[PDB]
Every structure is written in structure tokens, then in C-alpha cells.
Design an enzyme around this catalytic site. Structure first.
Site, PDB file in Angstrom:
ATOM      1  N   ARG A  99     130.005  10.036  32.187  1.00 37.99           N
ATOM      2  CA  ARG A  99     130.431  11.007  33.446  1.00 37.99           C
ATOM      3  C   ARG A  99     131.540  11.200  33.193  1.00 37.99           C
ATOM      4  NH1 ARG A  99     130.997  10.757  40.023  1.00 37.99           N
ATOM      5  NH2 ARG A  99     129.399  12.703  40.123  1.00 37.99           N
ATOM      6  N   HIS A 139     132.861  15.308  33.601  1.00 35.82           N
ATOM      7  CA  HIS A 139     133.579  15.771  34.656  1.00 35.82           C
ATOM      8  C   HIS A 139     135.060  16.125  34.012  1.00 35.82           C
ATOM      9  CE1 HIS A 139     132.232  14.140  38.621  1.00 35.82           C
ATOM     10  NE2 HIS A 139     131.164  14.925  37.835  1.00 35.82           N
ATOM     11  N   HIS A 145     121.435  11.643  34.163  1.00 36.00           N
ATOM     12  CA  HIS A 145     121.059  10.984  35.075  1.00 36.00           C
ATOM     13  C   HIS A 145     120.147   9.790  34.974  1.00 36.00           C
ATOM     14  CE1 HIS A 145     123.092  13.625  38.359  1.00 36.00           C
ATOM     15  NE2 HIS A 145     123.866  13.082  37.580  1.00 36.00           N
ATOM     16  N   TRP A 168     118.577   6.028  39.348  1.00 37.12           N
ATOM     17  CA  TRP A 168     117.402   6.799  39.074  1.00 37.12           C
ATOM     18  C   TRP A 168     116.241   6.236  38.229  1.00 37.12           C
ATOM     19  CZ3 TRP A 168     122.835   8.143  38.379  1.00 37.12           C
ATOM     20  CH2 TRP A 168     123.146   9.100  39.216  1.00 37.12           C
TER      21      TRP A 168
HETATM   22  C1  HEM Z   1     124.010  19.497  39.681  1.00 34.73           C
HETATM   23  C2  HEM Z   1     124.906  18.759  38.722  1.00 34.73           C
HETATM   24  C3  HEM Z   1     125.019  17.418  39.214  1.00 34.73           C
HETATM   25  C4  HEM Z   1     125.665  16.727  40.349  1.00 34.73           C
HETATM   26  C5  HEM Z   1     125.670  17.105  41.547  1.00 34.73           C
HETATM   27  C6  HEM Z   1     125.670  15.399  39.877  1.00 34.73           C
HETATM   28  C7  HEM Z   1     126.004  14.206  40.887  1.00 34.73           C
HETATM   29  C8  HEM Z   1     126.278  12.957  40.549  1.00 34.73           C
HETATM   30  C9  HEM Z   1     126.512  11.816  41.738  1.00 34.73           C
HETATM   31  C10 HEM Z   1     126.698  12.344  43.220  1.00 34.73           C
HETATM   32  C11 HEM Z   1     126.761  10.733  41.057  1.00 34.73           C
HETATM   33  C12 HEM Z   1     126.945   9.389  41.481  1.00 34.73           C
HETATM   34  C13 HEM Z   1     128.615   9.295  41.493  1.00 34.73           C
HETATM   35  C14 HEM Z   1     128.471   7.652  42.027  1.00 34.73           C
HETATM   36  O1  HEM Z   1     128.170   7.341  43.287  1.00 34.73           O
HETATM   37  O2  HEM Z   1     129.079   6.790  41.160  1.00 34.73           O
HETATM   38  C15 HEM Z   1     126.492  11.113  39.563  1.00 34.73           C
HETATM   39  C16 HEM Z   1     126.650  10.305  38.726  1.00 34.73           C
HETATM   40  C17 HEM Z   1     126.278  10.343  37.206  1.00 34.73           C
HETATM   41  N1  HEM Z   1     126.183  11.759  36.542  1.00 34.73           N
HETATM   42 FE1  HEM Z   1     126.135  13.439  37.608  1.00 34.73          FE
HETATM   43  N2  HEM Z   1     125.722  15.171  38.798  1.00 34.73           N
HETATM   44  C18 HEM Z   1     125.320  16.272  38.122  1.00 34.73           C
HETATM   45  C19 HEM Z   1     125.405  16.658  36.565  1.00 34.73           C
HETATM   46  C20 HEM Z   1     125.561  15.824  35.687  1.00 34.73           C
HETATM   47  C21 HEM Z   1     125.608  15.960  34.252  1.00 34.73           C
HETATM   48  C22 HEM Z   1     125.646  17.453  33.892  1.00 34.73           C
HETATM   49  C23 HEM Z   1     125.931  14.880  33.711  1.00 34.73           C
HETATM   50  C24 HEM Z   1     126.432  14.619  32.164  1.00 34.73           C
HETATM   51  C25 HEM Z   1     125.527  15.211  31.350  1.00 34.73           C
HETATM   52  C26 HEM Z   1     125.953  13.623  34.721  1.00 34.73           C
HETATM   53  C27 HEM Z   1     126.180  12.364  34.213  1.00 34.73           C
HETATM   54  C28 HEM Z   1     126.263  11.496  35.320  1.00 34.73           C
HETATM   55  C29 HEM Z   1     126.431   9.925  35.027  1.00 34.73           C
HETATM   56  C30 HEM Z   1     126.083   9.361  33.794  1.00 34.73           C
HETATM   57  C31 HEM Z   1     126.246   9.380  36.207  1.00 34.73           C
HETATM   58  C32 HEM Z   1     126.371   7.920  36.335  1.00 34.73           C
HETATM   59  C33 HEM Z   1     127.882   7.494  36.526  1.00 34.73           C
HETATM   60  C34 HEM Z   1     127.878   5.976  37.078  1.00 34.73           C
HETATM   61  O3  HEM Z   1     126.862   5.239  36.806  1.00 34.73           O
HETATM   62  O4  HEM Z   1     129.005   5.484  36.970  1.00 34.73           O
HETATM   63  N3  HEM Z   1     125.894  14.269  35.932  1.00 34.73           N
HETATM   64  N4  HEM Z   1     126.193  12.335  39.421  1.00 34.73           N
END
Ligand code: HEM
Length: 291
Positions: free
Chosen positions: A45, A49, A172, A188
Site C-alpha cells: 500500500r 499511495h 486487496h 478481504w
Molecule cells: C478505488 C481504489 C482504492 C480504494 C478506495 C482503496 C481503499 C483502501 C482502504 C480504505 C484500505 C484500508 C486502509 C486501512 O484501514 O488500513 C485499503 C487497504 C489496502 N489497499 Fe487499497 N484502495 C484502493 C486501491 C488500491 C490499490 C490500487 C492497491 C495497490 C495495488 C491497494 C492496496 C491496498 C493494500 C495492500 C491494503 C491493505 C493495507 C494494510 O493491510 O495495511 N489499494 N485500501
């Protein structure tokens, strides 16, 4: 603003494989983080970001300048929790002070995906740190409470098409949402530190219920204990996204290949690679090295 990749002086593939390896060894060692999820997901992430602030219209933001190191960006509410990935990388940067910040943040993501048994992600060096005033403002990363039209329009700014968006969203599978961090809670799926196509399978096969979480936000929940954000769920509400979700749910290799391309592209948006730049590097995993 043109950002030309500039290879860290004298460095070559072996130097970056050493950085890879140090990241990978710390990923293995520091396994307790996040209830034993480990740092893989937050490093992926972080890479996203730090890249996803890019605006194709004027080449602001993006991975090149490593601007997350400045307080405006590290304190973006959208980046809540990523400080853990940054702190992870700090001893790596101390050992290898020659690597640029953008190169390290993006390489962390590549390394995490690969060490979690994901696809190989070719990676190019040459990001150069840019000054504090080049840090993009907050608000360029996406909201989660929105629909497919939002998602599609959002990602046009990153020059991603429907296939690239659906592929990228497969990340995700990894990690989880954390209520205090964003207002959503739950993983997820089951395999959340192994890179697989589970996100798509769960979207199609779980029985999802639209519920409110304890932050009063709606999310989709299953009896297995999994969740989907509204933007995740939008991928099966929109018929164009749905077709692609089904493709990836039914072909792991295709997902791997398309993710690899899209993720490299994401990490490279905004960067001009000279004609005589090195070819992209494909790092060996620790396992492939016998380490
Ligand atoms: C419409 C696009 C996206 C939205 C709205 C979104 C939103 C989110 C949200 C709300 C979280 C949870 C953050 C938390 O509470 O720790 C999250 C986690 C994450 N997202 Fe996204 N995301 C999007 C796209 C992506 C993309 C493009 C990637 C990478 C290719 C990505 C990779 C991750 C990963 C790996 C996590 C888990 C982080 C953790 O466990 O600490 N996301 N995302």
C-alpha cells in the site's frame, strides 16, 4: 515538469538486489506486525499511495520524488497507517543510504508482492528525491465509499483503464481494513499475506450483506468474516468490471501477468526513462536465491 530517471551513481542490478534482499529478510523477521499479517501488505500500500498521487495532466505527484518523507504527505489522512511501512524501511535506508526515497518506497512494494509469492514485477531505478515544495497536496488518493463511476473516473487521472483498475484492485487480497485507520474494518479474505486472486473469488462467491461498521460506515460483510469496501463491490455492480473480475477469478496466471504490468506502470507513471537507461530489473526472491 519532466522527471528523468537518473541511476544512483555507479549502481547496478546487484546493488538493488541487495536492497531487495534486506527488505525481504526484514519482512521475514518482523513477522508479528498487525497480528502476524506482517509488513507485506502495508508495504504494497505504501508503494501504491506514494505513486498514486500522480496527475497525468501536469505530472505532479507520482513516485519519482519520494515526497511521502515530507509531513504534508505522510500526514495525509488517506495515508493513515503507512507510517508503519515507512518505519520498516528506515533501517533499510540507513544501510543503503544511496538509494533514493522513491526508489525505496516503490521497491518495497515490488519486494513485498514477490516475497508474498505474487508475480515478478519488473522494476526500474532512477527516481530522484525532489524538494518539500514538490509534495502534492492531500486529497489525490481515492475515497472508498463511492461507486463504479467514481472508481473509473478516479483512475483515468492515473491513466488506468478498466482492466488495469480491476487488476490493481486485486491487491486487496492483502492485509485488512483497520477501523481507526480509515473507518472500515476487516480482511478481504483468508490468504491475506500470500498474493493470490482470492479477492475476485470472494467477490463472486461469498454471500455479501450491506452492513454498517462501528464507525457508522457501510461496508459489505460475509459470514466468513470478510469484507469489501463499496468501491470493491462496485467491481461486480458495473457490468464491464464484472466481466474482468470473472476473468481473474478464473485465471490466476492472467491476473498475475496483468497485475504485474499495471503495478509496474503505476510505479513508473511520471518518469521518463532515457533511451540508454538500464532495462528493468527482475529481482530473485529469497527463496530463489536459497536465502
Ligand atoms: C478505488 C481504489 C482504492 C480504494 C478506495 C482503496 C481503499 C483502501 C482502504 C480504505 C484500505 C484500508 C486502509 C486501512 O484501514 O488500513 C485499503 C487497504 C489496502 N489497499 Fe487499497 N484502495 C484502493 C486501491 C488500491 C490499490 C490500487 C492497491 C495497490 C495495488 C491497494 C492496496 C491496498 C493494500 C495492500 C491494503 C491493505 C493495507 C494494510 O493491510 O495495511 N489499494 N485500501
Amino acid at each position: 515538469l519532466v522527471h528523468v530517471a537518473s541511476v544512483e551513481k555507479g549502481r547496478s542490478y546487484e546493488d538493488f538486489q541487495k536492497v531487495y534482499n534486506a527488505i525481504a529478510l526484514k519482512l521475514r523477521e518482523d513477522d508479528e506486525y498487525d497480528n502476524y499479517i506482517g509488513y507485506g501488505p502495508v508495504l504494497v500500500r505504501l508503494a501504491w499511495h506514494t505513486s498514486g498521487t500522480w496527475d497525468k495532466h501536469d505530472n505532479t505527484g507520482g513516485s519519482y520524488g519520494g515526497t511521502y518523507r515530507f509531513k504534508k504527505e505522510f500526514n495525509d489522512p488517506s495515508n493513515a497507517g503507512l507510517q508503519n511501512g515507512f518505519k520498516f524501511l528506515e533501517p533499510i535506508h540507513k544501510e543503503f543510504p544511496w538509494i533514493s526515497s522513491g526508489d525505496l518506497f516503490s521497491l518495497g512494494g515490488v519486494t513485498a508482492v514477490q516475497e508474498m509469492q505474487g508475480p515478478k514485477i519488473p522494476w526500474r531505478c532512477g527516481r530522484v528525491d525532489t524538494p518539500e515544495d514538490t509534495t502534492p497536496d492531500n486529497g489525490r488518493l481515492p475515497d472508498a465509499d463511492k461507486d463504479a463511476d467514481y472508481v473509473r473516473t478516479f483512475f483515468q487521472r492515473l491513466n488506468m483503464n478498466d482492466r488495469e483498475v480491476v487488476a490493481l484492485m486485486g491487491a486487496h487480497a492483502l492485509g485488512k481494513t483497520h477501523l481507526k485507520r480509515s473507518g472500515y474494518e476487516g480482511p478481504w479474505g483468508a490468504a491475506n499475506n500470500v498474493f493470490t486472486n482470492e479477492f475476485y473469488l470472494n467477490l463472486l462467491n461469498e454471500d455479501w450483506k450491506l452492513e454498517k461498521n462501528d464507525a457508522n460506515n457501510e461496508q459489505w460483510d460475509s459470514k466468513s468474516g470478510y469484507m469489501m469496501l463499496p468501491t470493491d463491490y462496485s467491481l461486480i455492480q458495473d457490468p464491464k468490471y464484472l466481466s474482468i473480475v470473472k476473468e481473474y477469478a478464473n485465471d490466476q496466471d492472467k491476473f498475475f501477468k496483468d497485475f504485474s504490468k499495471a503495478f509496474e506502470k503505476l510505479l513508473e507513471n511520471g518518469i521518463t526513462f532515457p533511451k540508454d537507461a538500464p532495462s528493468p530489473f527482475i529481482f530473485k526472491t529469497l527463496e530463489e536465491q536459497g536465502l
